[PDB]
Amino acid sequence: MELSFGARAELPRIHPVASKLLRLMQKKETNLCLSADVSLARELLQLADALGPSICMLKTHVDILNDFTLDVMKELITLAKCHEFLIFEDRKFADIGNTVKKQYEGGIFKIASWADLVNAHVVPGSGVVKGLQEVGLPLHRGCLLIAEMSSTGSLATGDYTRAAVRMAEEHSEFVVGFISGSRVSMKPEFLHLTPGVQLEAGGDNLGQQYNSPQEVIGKRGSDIIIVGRGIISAADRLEAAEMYRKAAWEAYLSRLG
Amino acid sequence: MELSFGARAELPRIHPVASKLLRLMQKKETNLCLSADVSLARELLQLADALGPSICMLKTHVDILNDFTLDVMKELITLAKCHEFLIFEDRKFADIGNTVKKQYEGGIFKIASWADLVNAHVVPGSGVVKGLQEVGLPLHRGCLLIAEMSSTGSLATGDYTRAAVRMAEEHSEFVVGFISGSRVSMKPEFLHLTPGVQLEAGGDNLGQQYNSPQEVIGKRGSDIIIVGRGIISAADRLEAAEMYRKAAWEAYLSRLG
Ligand SMILES: O=c1cc(O)n([C@@H]2O[C@H](COP(=O)(O)O)[C@@H](O)[C@H]2O)c(=O)[nH]1
Ligand SMILES: O=c1cc(O)n([C@@H]2O[C@H](COP(=O)(O)O)[C@@H](O)[C@H]2O)c(=O)[nH]1
Ligand code: PRO
Ligand code: PRO
């Protein structure tokens, strides 16, 4: 009884940020999240503009942007609105609730002011979510919980993964899904986003491991692929993004049947 | 066969950053780390100057400083050198190795340029440490691994804690100890730093739980207490720091016997 992205966007318990995302995924035929892991604002913005039509989401690491300003993020929002994609700051909040609330709202990045989505590790216990939601619920934001990781030696397995799913399902007013390698929740209101994706087999020299779009979307049941170097290190990033988009989209279609 | 801090500073396998810390702890009779969880640079610097003689370490969250600049960190270094304490940026790196290397060296904070110590969660596997050490070893820095957390529902227990200890003991050229609630390693070359500390019982409304200096240093065998609100929310932060310093130091002495 698997529903399309467009039908999932209408589910009774859907979060509004998840619904917006699912609707634009269906409209644009994309379940690709670009991992824009660059250090220059101009490159970030040029990628966002050119690849915007091909992506459902742009994932940032603003803390690696050498020339971050809030006005860069204003320009990114313009592109996100134009091309219709969400902005996901991959901050991996991972502290006690009292600390993460300040890290999300404040400092020089003011993440909550521009990021539709953020994510959190579950290791601190549910206070990490409660602290973020003090800021994010008034701002109509969503959060993803890290239930599994792609890297060698990941401890996000077994009972840890189960705890992440329970934490999400108990904070569904704010948590909209997971970073995971596979479908971890049986509730269709939750999004599954999977990093560690390339077309070719392999990894990196610092513990990254890759699986293909067909494997992660088609076999493992995830919704969205997160792709960094498979796109950004290519010469033609637009054609690379299109290859990843077509791969992930067809894997999704074939699995709906 | 418990050694004093000053003797631990001479151990054959000691890391140079740990040795520097242990020597100044012994010299100054302090095993207190101030958690300087403030949003203004002037308050950060005024606390560092006034409390510097009372502390072995100042723990920052630079991502909550509304008016961060690199020149603020230059002024903090001056105070750290004057008063003899280490600077610990509590960034909780928690990503794949390729990402954390960039988050540690780069962006607007350039953490590795000013922080003696950083810390990491072990959930990604050991690539998190390998990525950080690509930057931190050339810069003669150290790292702490988060083996336990103070907050309600923490998943850093059992086999997760054991994995953190193994990861530290296999990366001892860079990892100098732990964030933990107790002694987790039997190797005296590793430092144990414990947050979730107040003189009075209680917690916060976002999952923080407190234990006393006597409990954590004296019974649970930790080395250093990390104290935020128990000091910073007090009217007289200097006298508060002195009360925490005296508590932690006496608990350490009584346990050496
Ligand atoms: O398990 C995880 C979780 C992540 O967010 N990531 C992130 O996804 C991206 C992967 O990038 P790449 O495709 O270049 O390996 C990085 O930004 C990384 O921080 C990951 O690789 N694995
Ligand atoms: O297990 C942990 C790990 C931490 O670093 N911390 C940090 O230690 C400090 C605790 O502050 P406080 O004493 O105000 O509760 C915070 O900066 C928090 O981020 C913690 O409380 N528990
Ligand atoms: O792992 C494999 O064999 C295939 C080849 C390309 C990606 N997956
Ligand atoms: O928990 C208790 O009872 C004591 C009282 C102060 C701190 N510890």
Coordinates of C-alpha atoms and ligand atoms in Angstrom, one line a residue:
Chain A
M1 CA 0.0 0.0 0.0
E2 CA 2.8 2.4 -1.0
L3 CA 1.7 5.9 -1.8
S4 CA 3.3 8.3 -4.3
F5 CA 5.1 11.4 -3.0
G6 CA 2.1 13.5 -4.0
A7 CA -0.3 11.4 -2.0
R8 CA 2.1 11.3 0.9
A9 CA 2.0 15.1 0.8
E10 CA -1.7 14.9 1.7
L11 CA -1.5 12.4 4.6
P12 CA -3.4 13.5 7.7
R13 CA -0.4 13.6 10.0
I14 CA 2.0 15.1 7.5
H15 CA 4.1 18.0 8.7
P16 CA 3.7 21.2 6.5
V17 CA 7.4 21.3 5.6
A18 CA 7.3 17.6 4.6
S19 CA 4.1 18.3 2.5
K20 CA 5.7 21.2 0.7
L21 CA 8.8 19.1 -0.1
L22 CA 6.8 16.1 -1.3
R23 CA 4.6 18.2 -3.5
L24 CA 7.6 19.8 -5.2
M25 CA 9.3 16.4 -5.6
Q26 CA 6.2 15.1 -7.4
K27 CA 5.9 18.3 -9.5
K28 CA 9.5 18.4 -10.6
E29 CA 10.2 14.7 -10.8
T30 CA 13.1 15.0 -8.4
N31 CA 14.1 13.2 -5.2
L32 CA 17.7 14.5 -5.4
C33 CA 19.2 16.6 -2.6
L34 CA 22.4 18.4 -3.7
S35 CA 25.1 18.4 -0.9
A36 CA 26.6 21.7 -1.8
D37 CA 29.9 21.1 0.0
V38 CA 31.8 24.1 -1.3
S39 CA 33.7 26.9 0.4
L40 CA 32.8 29.9 -1.8
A41 CA 29.5 31.7 -1.7
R42 CA 29.7 32.4 -5.5
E43 CA 30.1 28.7 -6.2
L44 CA 27.2 27.8 -3.8
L45 CA 24.9 30.3 -5.5
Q46 CA 25.9 29.4 -9.0
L47 CA 25.3 25.7 -8.2
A48 CA 21.9 26.5 -6.6
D49 CA 20.8 28.5 -9.6
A50 CA 21.9 26.0 -12.3
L51 CA 20.9 22.9 -10.4
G52 CA 17.8 24.3 -8.8
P53 CA 15.4 22.8 -11.3
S54 CA 16.9 19.4 -10.9
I55 CA 16.8 19.2 -7.1
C56 CA 14.2 18.9 -4.3
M57 CA 16.6 20.2 -1.7
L58 CA 20.0 21.9 -1.3
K59 CA 21.9 20.8 1.8
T60 CA 24.4 23.3 3.2
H61 CA 27.3 23.2 5.6
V62 CA 27.4 26.9 6.3
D63 CA 30.3 26.5 8.7
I64 CA 32.6 25.6 5.8
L65 CA 31.7 28.7 3.7
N66 CA 34.7 31.0 3.9
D67 CA 32.7 34.1 2.9
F68 CA 29.4 33.4 4.7
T69 CA 27.2 36.4 5.4
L70 CA 23.4 36.5 6.1
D71 CA 23.0 38.2 2.7
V72 CA 24.4 35.1 1.0
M73 CA 21.6 33.2 2.6
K74 CA 19.1 35.8 1.5
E75 CA 20.3 35.2 -2.1
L76 CA 20.0 31.4 -1.6
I77 CA 16.4 31.8 -0.4
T78 CA 15.6 33.7 -3.6
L79 CA 16.9 30.8 -5.6
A80 CA 15.1 28.3 -3.5
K81 CA 11.8 30.1 -4.0
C82 CA 12.4 30.6 -7.7
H83 CA 13.4 27.0 -8.5
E84 CA 11.3 25.4 -5.7
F85 CA 13.6 23.5 -3.4
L86 CA 14.1 23.4 0.4
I87 CA 17.2 24.5 2.2
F88 CA 18.6 22.0 4.7
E89 CA 21.4 23.1 7.0
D90 CA 23.3 19.9 7.9
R91 CA 24.4 21.1 11.3
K92 CA 24.0 17.8 13.1
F93 CA 22.9 19.4 16.4
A94 CA 24.2 17.1 19.1
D95 CA 24.2 18.9 22.4
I96 CA 21.9 19.3 25.4
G97 CA 18.7 21.1 24.7
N98 CA 19.7 24.3 26.4
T99 CA 22.7 24.6 24.2
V100 CA 21.2 23.6 20.8
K101 CA 18.4 26.1 21.1
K102 CA 21.0 28.9 21.1
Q103 CA 23.1 27.3 18.4
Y104 CA 20.0 27.1 16.2
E105 CA 18.6 30.6 16.7
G106 CA 21.7 32.7 17.3
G107 CA 25.3 33.3 16.8
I108 CA 26.6 34.6 13.5
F109 CA 24.8 32.0 11.4
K110 CA 21.2 32.5 12.6
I111 CA 20.4 29.1 11.1
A112 CA 16.7 29.0 12.0
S113 CA 16.1 32.3 10.1
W114 CA 17.0 30.7 6.7
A115 CA 17.0 26.9 6.9
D116 CA 13.7 25.1 6.2
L117 CA 15.2 21.9 7.7
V118 CA 18.0 21.1 10.1
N119 CA 19.1 17.8 11.6
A120 CA 20.1 16.3 14.9
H121 CA 21.9 13.4 16.4
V122 CA 19.8 11.4 18.9
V123 CA 22.7 10.6 21.3
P124 CA 21.9 13.3 23.8
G125 CA 18.4 12.0 24.3
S126 CA 15.2 13.8 23.4
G127 CA 16.1 17.1 25.0
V128 CA 18.1 17.8 21.8
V129 CA 14.8 17.8 19.9
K130 CA 12.9 19.7 22.7
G131 CA 15.5 22.4 22.6
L132 CA 15.5 22.8 18.9
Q133 CA 11.7 22.8 18.7
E134 CA 11.5 25.8 21.1
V135 CA 13.0 27.8 18.3
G136 CA 11.8 25.8 15.3
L137 CA 8.1 25.4 16.0
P138 CA 7.4 29.1 16.2
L139 CA 9.4 29.5 13.0
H140 CA 7.4 26.7 11.2
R141 CA 10.6 24.7 10.6
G142 CA 11.3 21.0 10.5
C143 CA 14.0 18.6 11.7
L144 CA 15.5 15.3 10.6
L145 CA 17.0 12.8 13.0
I146 CA 20.1 10.9 12.2
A147 CA 19.1 7.2 12.5
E148 CA 22.0 5.6 10.5
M149 CA 25.3 6.9 9.1
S150 CA 27.1 5.9 5.9
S151 CA 30.6 5.9 7.3
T152 CA 32.8 3.0 8.3
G153 CA 32.4 2.1 12.0
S154 CA 29.1 4.0 12.4
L155 CA 27.5 3.3 15.8
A156 CA 24.1 4.4 14.6
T157 CA 22.8 0.8 14.4
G158 CA 20.5 -1.6 16.2
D159 CA 18.9 -0.1 19.3
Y160 CA 20.4 3.3 18.5
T161 CA 18.5 3.4 15.2
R162 CA 15.3 2.2 17.0
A163 CA 15.7 5.0 19.6
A164 CA 15.9 7.5 16.8
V165 CA 12.7 6.2 15.2
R166 CA 10.9 6.4 18.5
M167 CA 12.2 9.9 19.2
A168 CA 10.9 11.0 15.8
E169 CA 7.5 9.4 16.2
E170 CA 7.1 11.1 19.6
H171 CA 8.1 14.6 18.3
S172 CA 6.2 14.5 15.0
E173 CA 5.1 18.1 15.4
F174 CA 8.7 19.1 14.5
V175 CA 10.5 16.0 13.2
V176 CA 9.7 15.2 9.6
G177 CA 12.0 12.3 8.9
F178 CA 15.4 10.8 9.0
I179 CA 18.9 10.7 7.7
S180 CA 19.4 7.0 7.2
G181 CA 20.7 4.4 4.8
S182 CA 17.3 2.8 4.3
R183 CA 13.7 3.0 5.3
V184 CA 13.7 2.9 9.1
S185 CA 10.1 3.9 9.9
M186 CA 7.0 2.2 8.6
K187 CA 5.0 5.5 8.9
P188 CA 4.7 7.1 5.4
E189 CA 4.6 10.6 6.9
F190 CA 8.3 10.4 7.6
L191 CA 10.9 11.3 4.9
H192 CA 14.0 9.2 4.5
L193 CA 17.1 11.0 3.1
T194 CA 20.2 8.9 2.3
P195 CA 23.7 10.2 1.9
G196 CA 26.7 8.1 0.9
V197 CA 25.5 7.9 -2.7
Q198 CA 27.4 7.6 -6.0
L199 CA 26.7 5.9 -9.3
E200 CA 30.0 4.0 -9.1
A201 CA 31.2 1.8 -6.2
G202 CA 33.7 2.9 -3.7
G203 CA 34.3 5.4 -0.9
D204 CA 36.8 8.0 0.3
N205 CA 39.9 7.8 2.4
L206 CA 38.2 9.0 5.5
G207 CA 35.5 6.4 6.0
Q208 CA 32.8 7.4 3.5
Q209 CA 31.2 4.4 1.8
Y210 CA 29.0 4.7 -1.3
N211 CA 25.9 2.9 -2.5
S212 CA 24.0 3.6 -5.7
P213 CA 20.7 5.4 -6.2
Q214 CA 19.1 2.2 -7.3
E215 CA 20.2 0.4 -4.2
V216 CA 19.2 3.0 -1.7
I217 CA 15.9 4.1 -3.2
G218 CA 14.9 0.9 -5.0
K219 CA 16.0 -1.8 -2.6
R220 CA 16.5 -0.1 0.7
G221 CA 13.3 2.0 0.4
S222 CA 14.6 5.5 1.0
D223 CA 13.0 8.6 -0.5
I224 CA 15.7 11.1 -1.3
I225 CA 19.4 10.7 -2.2
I226 CA 21.9 13.2 -0.9
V227 CA 24.9 13.6 -3.3
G228 CA 28.0 15.7 -2.8
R229 CA 31.2 14.8 -4.6
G230 CA 29.5 12.6 -7.3
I231 CA 28.1 15.9 -8.5
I232 CA 30.3 18.7 -7.3
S233 CA 33.7 17.1 -8.4
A234 CA 32.3 16.4 -11.9
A235 CA 33.1 18.9 -14.7
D236 CA 29.5 19.4 -15.8
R237 CA 27.6 19.6 -12.5
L238 CA 24.3 20.1 -14.3
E239 CA 24.5 16.9 -16.3
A240 CA 25.8 15.1 -13.2
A241 CA 22.8 16.3 -11.2
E242 CA 20.5 15.2 -14.0
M243 CA 22.0 11.7 -14.0
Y244 CA 21.5 11.4 -10.3
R245 CA 18.0 12.8 -10.5
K246 CA 17.0 10.3 -13.2
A247 CA 18.5 7.4 -11.3
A248 CA 16.7 8.2 -8.1
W249 CA 13.4 9.1 -9.7
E250 CA 13.2 5.9 -11.8
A251 CA 14.2 3.8 -8.7
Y252 CA 11.3 5.4 -6.9
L253 CA 8.9 4.8 -9.7
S254 CA 9.8 1.2 -10.2
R255 CA 9.5 0.4 -6.4
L256 CA 5.5 2.2 -6.4
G257 CA 4.9 0.0 -9.3
Chain B
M1 CA 48.5 3.4 42.2
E2 CA 46.8 6.7 41.4
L3 CA 49.2 9.5 40.3
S4 CA 48.8 13.2 41.0
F5 CA 48.0 15.5 38.1
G6 CA 51.7 16.7 38.1
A7 CA 53.0 13.1 37.8
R8 CA 50.4 12.2 35.1
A9 CA 51.8 15.2 33.1
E10 CA 55.1 13.3 32.9
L11 CA 53.8 9.9 31.8
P12 CA 55.6 8.3 28.8
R13 CA 52.6 8.2 26.6
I14 CA 51.1 11.6 27.6
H15 CA 50.0 13.9 24.8
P16 CA 51.8 17.4 25.0
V17 CA 48.5 19.2 25.3
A18 CA 47.4 17.0 28.1
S19 CA 50.8 17.4 29.8
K20 CA 50.5 21.2 29.6
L21 CA 47.0 21.1 31.0
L22 CA 47.9 18.7 33.9
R23 CA 50.9 20.8 34.8
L24 CA 48.9 24.0 35.1
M25 CA 46.2 22.2 37.0
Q26 CA 48.8 21.2 39.6
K27 CA 50.4 24.6 39.7
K28 CA 47.2 26.5 40.1
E29 CA 45.3 24.0 42.2
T30 CA 42.4 23.9 39.8
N31 CA 40.5 21.2 38.0
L32 CA 37.6 23.5 37.0
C33 CA 36.7 24.2 33.4
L34 CA 34.4 27.2 33.0
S35 CA 31.6 26.7 30.4
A36 CA 31.5 30.2 29.2
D37 CA 28.0 29.9 27.6
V38 CA 27.4 33.6 26.9
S39 CA 26.4 35.5 23.7
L40 CA 28.5 38.6 24.1
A41 CA 32.2 38.8 23.4
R42 CA 32.7 41.4 26.1
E43 CA 31.1 39.1 28.7
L44 CA 33.2 36.2 27.5
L45 CA 36.4 38.2 27.8
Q46 CA 35.5 39.8 31.1
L47 CA 34.8 36.3 32.5
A48 CA 38.0 34.9 31.1
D49 CA 40.1 37.6 32.6
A50 CA 38.5 37.6 36.1
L51 CA 38.1 33.8 36.4
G52 CA 41.3 32.9 34.5
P53 CA 43.3 32.4 37.7
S54 CA 40.6 30.0 39.0
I55 CA 40.3 27.7 36.0
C56 CA 42.4 25.2 34.1
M57 CA 40.3 25.6 30.9
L58 CA 37.7 27.8 29.3
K59 CA 35.1 25.9 27.2
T60 CA 33.5 27.9 24.4
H61 CA 30.5 27.6 22.1
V62 CA 31.7 30.1 19.5
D63 CA 28.6 29.5 17.4
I64 CA 26.4 31.2 20.1
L65 CA 28.6 34.4 20.2
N66 CA 26.5 37.1 18.5
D67 CA 29.6 39.2 17.9
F68 CA 32.2 36.6 17.1
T69 CA 35.3 37.8 15.2
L70 CA 38.7 36.2 14.9
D71 CA 40.1 39.2 16.8
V72 CA 37.9 38.2 19.8
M73 CA 39.6 34.9 19.8
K74 CA 43.0 36.6 19.6
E75 CA 42.1 38.5 22.8
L76 CA 40.9 35.3 24.4
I77 CA 44.3 33.7 23.6
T78 CA 46.1 36.6 25.3
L79 CA 44.1 35.9 28.5
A80 CA 44.6 32.2 28.3
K81 CA 48.4 32.7 28.0
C82 CA 48.4 35.3 30.8
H83 CA 46.3 33.3 33.3
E84 CA 47.4 29.9 32.1
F85 CA 44.4 28.0 30.9
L86 CA 43.5 26.0 27.8
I87 CA 40.8 27.0 25.3
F88 CA 38.3 24.1 24.5
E89 CA 35.9 24.8 21.6
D90 CA 32.9 22.5 22.4
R91 CA 31.9 22.0 18.8
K92 CA 31.0 18.3 19.1
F93 CA 32.1 17.4 15.6
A94 CA 29.9 14.6 14.5
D95 CA 30.1 14.1 10.7
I96 CA 32.1 12.0 8.3
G97 CA 35.8 12.6 8.2
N98 CA 35.8 14.6 5.0
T99 CA 33.3 17.1 6.3
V100 CA 34.7 17.6 9.8
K101 CA 38.2 18.4 8.5
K102 CA 36.7 21.4 6.7
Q103 CA 34.5 22.4 9.7
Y104 CA 37.6 22.3 12.0
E105 CA 40.0 24.3 9.8
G106 CA 37.8 26.6 7.8
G107 CA 34.7 28.6 7.5
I108 CA 34.4 31.8 9.4
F109 CA 35.4 30.4 12.8
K110 CA 38.8 28.8 11.9
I111 CA 38.5 26.8 15.1
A112 CA 41.8 24.9 14.8
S113 CA 43.6 28.3 14.7
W114 CA 42.7 29.2 18.2
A115 CA 41.3 26.1 20.1
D116 CA 43.8 24.0 22.0
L117 CA 41.1 21.3 22.4
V118 CA 38.0 20.3 20.5
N119 CA 35.7 17.3 20.9
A120 CA 33.9 14.8 18.8
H121 CA 31.0 12.4 19.0
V122 CA 32.0 8.8 18.1
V123 CA 28.8 7.9 16.4
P124 CA 30.2 8.3 12.8
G125 CA 33.0 5.8 13.5
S126 CA 36.7 6.6 13.6
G127 CA 36.8 8.6 10.4
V128 CA 35.5 11.5 12.5
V129 CA 38.8 11.4 14.4
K130 CA 40.9 10.7 11.3
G131 CA 39.4 13.7 9.6
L132 CA 40.0 16.0 12.5
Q133 CA 43.6 14.8 13.0
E134 CA 44.5 15.7 9.4
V135 CA 44.1 19.3 10.6
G136 CA 44.9 19.0 14.3
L137 CA 48.1 17.0 14.3
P138 CA 50.0 19.5 12.1
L139 CA 48.7 22.2 14.5
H140 CA 49.7 20.3 17.6
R141 CA 46.1 20.2 18.9
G142 CA 44.2 17.7 21.0
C143 CA 40.7 16.2 20.9
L144 CA 38.3 14.8 23.5
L145 CA 35.8 12.0 22.6
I146 CA 32.3 12.1 24.0
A147 CA 31.9 8.8 25.8
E148 CA 28.9 9.6 28.0
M149 CA 26.4 12.5 28.2
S150 CA 24.7 14.1 31.2
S151 CA 21.3 14.6 29.7
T152 CA 18.2 12.6 30.2
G153 CA 17.8 9.8 27.6
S154 CA 21.5 9.8 26.6
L155 CA 22.4 6.9 24.3
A156 CA 26.1 7.2 25.1
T157 CA 26.0 4.1 27.4
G158 CA 27.2 0.5 27.4
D159 CA 28.8 -0.6 24.2
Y160 CA 28.7 3.0 22.8
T161 CA 30.9 4.2 25.7
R162 CA 33.2 1.2 25.2
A163 CA 33.6 2.1 21.5
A164 CA 34.5 5.6 22.5
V165 CA 37.2 4.4 24.8
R166 CA 38.6 2.0 22.1
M167 CA 38.6 4.8 19.6
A168 CA 40.5 7.1 21.9
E169 CA 43.1 4.5 22.8
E170 CA 43.7 3.8 19.1
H171 CA 44.1 7.5 18.2
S172 CA 46.2 8.5 21.2
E173 CA 48.4 10.8 19.1
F174 CA 45.5 13.2 18.9
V175 CA 42.9 12.1 21.4
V176 CA 43.7 13.2 24.9
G177 CA 40.6 12.2 26.8
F178 CA 36.9 12.1 27.2
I179 CA 33.8 14.0 28.0
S180 CA 32.1 11.6 30.4
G181 CA 30.3 11.3 33.6
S182 CA 32.9 9.2 35.3
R183 CA 36.2 7.5 34.7
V184 CA 35.8 5.4 31.6
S185 CA 39.4 4.6 30.8
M186 CA 41.9 2.9 33.1
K187 CA 44.8 4.5 31.3
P188 CA 46.0 7.5 33.3
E189 CA 47.2 9.4 30.2
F190 CA 43.6 10.2 29.4
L191 CA 41.8 13.1 30.9
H192 CA 38.2 12.8 32.0
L193 CA 36.1 16.0 31.9
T194 CA 32.6 16.0 33.3
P195 CA 29.8 18.4 32.6
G196 CA 26.4 18.4 34.3
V197 CA 27.8 19.7 37.5
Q198 CA 26.3 22.0 40.2
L199 CA 26.7 22.2 44.0
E200 CA 22.9 21.8 44.4
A201 CA 20.8 18.9 43.1
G202 CA 18.5 19.3 40.1
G203 CA 18.6 19.9 36.4
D204 CA 17.0 22.1 33.8
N205 CA 13.8 21.9 31.8
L206 CA 15.5 20.6 28.7
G207 CA 17.0 17.4 29.9
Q208 CA 20.1 18.6 31.8
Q209 CA 20.8 16.6 35.0
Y210 CA 23.3 17.8 37.7
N211 CA 25.7 16.0 40.0
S212 CA 28.0 17.5 42.5
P213 CA 31.8 18.0 42.3
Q214 CA 32.3 15.6 45.2
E215 CA 30.2 13.0 43.4
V216 CA 31.9 13.3 40.0
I217 CA 35.5 13.8 41.0
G218 CA 35.5 11.9 44.3
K219 CA 33.2 9.0 43.7
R220 CA 33.1 8.7 39.9
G221 CA 36.8 9.3 39.4
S222 CA 36.7 12.1 36.8
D223 CA 39.5 14.7 36.6
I224 CA 37.8 18.0 35.7
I225 CA 34.4 19.5 36.2
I226 CA 32.8 21.6 33.5
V227 CA 30.4 24.2 35.0
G228 CA 28.2 26.7 33.1
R229 CA 25.1 28.1 34.8
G230 CA 26.2 27.2 38.3
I231 CA 28.8 29.9 37.8
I232 CA 27.5 32.2 35.0
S233 CA 24.0 32.7 36.4
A234 CA 25.4 33.6 39.9
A235 CA 25.8 37.3 40.8
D236 CA 29.4 37.0 41.7
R237 CA 30.9 34.7 39.1
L238 CA 34.4 34.9 40.7
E239 CA 33.3 33.7 44.1
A240 CA 31.1 31.0 42.4
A241 CA 34.1 29.8 40.4
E242 CA 36.2 29.7 43.6
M243 CA 33.5 27.6 45.3
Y244 CA 33.5 25.1 42.4
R245 CA 37.3 25.1 42.2
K246 CA 37.7 24.4 45.9
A247 CA 35.1 21.6 45.7
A248 CA 36.7 19.9 42.7
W249 CA 40.2 20.2 44.0
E250 CA 39.5 18.8 47.5
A251 CA 37.5 15.9 46.0
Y252 CA 40.6 15.1 43.8
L253 CA 43.0 15.4 46.8
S254 CA 40.8 13.2 49.0
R255 CA 40.5 10.5 46.4
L256 CA 44.8 10.5 45.8
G257 CA 45.0 10.1 49.5
Ligands
LIG1 O1 25.7 9.4 7.2 C1 25.9 10.5 6.7 C2 25.3 11.7 7.1 C3 25.6 12.8 6.4 O2 24.9 13.9 6.5 N1 26.6 12.8 5.4 C4 26.9 14.1 4.6 O3 26.5 13.9 3.3 C5 27.5 14.4 2.4 C6 28.2 13.3 1.6 O4 29.0 13.9 0.7 P1 29.6 13.1 -0.5 O5 28.5 12.6 -1.4 O6 30.6 14.0 -1.2 O7 30.4 11.9 0.1 C7 28.5 15.2 3.3 O8 28.1 16.6 3.4 C8 28.3 14.6 4.6 O9 28.6 15.5 5.7 C9 27.2 11.6 5.0 O10 28.0 11.6 4.1 N2 26.9 10.5 5.7
LIG2 O1 27.1 15.6 28.4 C1 27.3 16.8 28.2 C2 28.2 17.3 27.3 C3 28.5 18.6 27.3 O2 29.4 19.2 26.6 N1 27.7 19.5 28.0 C4 27.9 21.0 27.9 O3 28.4 21.5 29.2 C5 27.7 22.7 29.5 C6 26.7 22.5 30.7 O4 26.3 23.8 31.1 P1 25.5 24.0 32.4 O5 26.5 23.7 33.6 O6 25.0 25.4 32.3 O7 24.4 23.0 32.5 C7 27.0 23.2 28.2 O8 27.8 24.0 27.4 C8 26.7 21.9 27.5 O9 26.7 22.1 26.1 C9 26.7 19.0 28.8 O10 26.0 19.8 29.5 N2 26.5 17.7 28.9
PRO3 O1 28.3 -2.2 -6.6 C1 28.2 -2.5 -7.8 O2 28.7 -3.5 -8.3 C2 27.3 -1.6 -8.7 C3 28.2 -1.1 -9.8 C4 27.9 0.4 -9.8 C5 27.3 0.8 -8.5 N1 26.8 -0.5 -7.9
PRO4 O1 22.1 15.1 45.9 C1 22.2 15.4 47.1 O2 21.4 15.1 48.0 C2 23.4 16.3 47.4 C3 22.9 17.6 48.0 C4 23.7 18.7 47.2 C5 24.3 18.0 46.0 N1 24.2 16.6 46.3

